[PDB]
């Protein structure tokens, strides 16, 4: 999927999780996630807590990649 609006959308189906559960979660309104998923706001300001609210990596439910933690 890779894109901000396809890889975001794809965990959230994957965690049967709603918009609004993951801005509650993340700190902000859903009409804010909603702007990613939509495919209007390709750079977040809130993109970590949307990351560790729905239990992924910012550059993959941003671009399809996962930070190569393990070196």
Do not use: H
């Amino acid at each position: 999927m890779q894109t901000l609006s396809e890889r975001l959308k794809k965990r959230r189906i994957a965690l049967k999780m709603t918009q609004t559960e993951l801005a509650t979660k993340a700190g902000v309104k859903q009409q804010s996630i909603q702007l990613i998923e939509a495919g209007v706001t390709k750079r977040p300001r809130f993109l970590f807590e949307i990351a560790m609210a729905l239990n992924c990596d910012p550059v993959w439910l941003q671009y399809g990649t996962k930070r190569g933690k393990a070196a």
